[PDB]
Short mmCIF file of C-alpha atoms in Angstrom, two decimals:
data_model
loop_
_atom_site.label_atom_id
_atom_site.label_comp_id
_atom_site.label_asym_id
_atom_site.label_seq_id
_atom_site.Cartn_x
_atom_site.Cartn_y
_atom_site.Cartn_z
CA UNK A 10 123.79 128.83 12.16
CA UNK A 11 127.17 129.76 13.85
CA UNK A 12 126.68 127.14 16.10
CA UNK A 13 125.37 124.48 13.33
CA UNK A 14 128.61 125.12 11.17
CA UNK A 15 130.71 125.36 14.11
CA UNK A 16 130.33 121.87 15.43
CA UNK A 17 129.99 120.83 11.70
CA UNK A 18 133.34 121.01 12.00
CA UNK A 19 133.74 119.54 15.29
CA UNK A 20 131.90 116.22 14.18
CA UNK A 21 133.47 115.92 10.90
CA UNK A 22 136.10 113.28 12.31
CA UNK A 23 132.87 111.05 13.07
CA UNK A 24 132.07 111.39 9.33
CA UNK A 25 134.61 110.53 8.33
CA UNK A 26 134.40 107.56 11.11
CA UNK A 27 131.14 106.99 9.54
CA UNK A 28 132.09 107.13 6.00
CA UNK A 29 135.44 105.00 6.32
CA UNK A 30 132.83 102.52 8.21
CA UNK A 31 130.82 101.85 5.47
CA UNK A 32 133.30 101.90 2.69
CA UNK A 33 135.19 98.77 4.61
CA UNK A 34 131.73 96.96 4.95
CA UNK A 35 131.18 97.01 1.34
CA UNK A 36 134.71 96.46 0.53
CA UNK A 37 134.03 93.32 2.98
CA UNK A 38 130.79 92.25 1.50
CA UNK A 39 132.38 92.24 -2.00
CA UNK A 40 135.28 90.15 -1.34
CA UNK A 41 132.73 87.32 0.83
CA UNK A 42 130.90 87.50 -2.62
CA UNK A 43 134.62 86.89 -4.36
CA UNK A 44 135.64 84.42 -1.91
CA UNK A 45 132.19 82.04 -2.67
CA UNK A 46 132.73 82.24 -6.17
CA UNK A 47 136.22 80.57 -5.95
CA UNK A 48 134.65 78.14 -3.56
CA UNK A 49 132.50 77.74 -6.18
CA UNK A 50 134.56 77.29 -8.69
CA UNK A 51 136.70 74.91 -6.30
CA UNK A 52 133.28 72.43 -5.91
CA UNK A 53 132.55 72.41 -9.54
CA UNK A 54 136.29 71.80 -10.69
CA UNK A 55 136.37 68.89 -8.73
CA UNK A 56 133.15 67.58 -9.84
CA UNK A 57 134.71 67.58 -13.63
CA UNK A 58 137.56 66.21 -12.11
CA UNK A 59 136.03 63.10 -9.96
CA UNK A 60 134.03 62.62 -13.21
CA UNK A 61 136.89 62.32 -15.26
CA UNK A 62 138.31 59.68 -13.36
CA UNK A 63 135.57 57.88 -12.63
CA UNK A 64 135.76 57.32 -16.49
CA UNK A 65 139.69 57.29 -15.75
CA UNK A 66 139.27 53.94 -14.29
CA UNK A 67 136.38 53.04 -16.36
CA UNK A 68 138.51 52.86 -19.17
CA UNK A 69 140.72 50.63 -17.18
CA UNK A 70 137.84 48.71 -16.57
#
């Protein structure tokens, strides 16, 4: 067990490798999942808005 909790030690700048890895992939994944939503937002605004101007220049009609 020396051993074991000697190189515990040794490898614990890969775990932290490891765990800082990870964190930023998440991190990553949840601001792609941010970033559709505005796109999403961004299509369906200007839906409402070539809608209300197709009835814009109905009016004028």
């Amino acid at each position: 067990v020396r051993a074991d909790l000697q190189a515990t030690a040794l490898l614990a700048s890969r775990g932290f490798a490891l765990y800082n890895a990870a964190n930023l992939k998440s991190i990553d994944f949840h601001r792609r999942i941010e970033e559709k939503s505005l796109a999403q937002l961004k299509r369906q605004m200007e839906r409402i808005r070539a809608k209300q101007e197709k009835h814009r220049q109905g009016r004028v009609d």
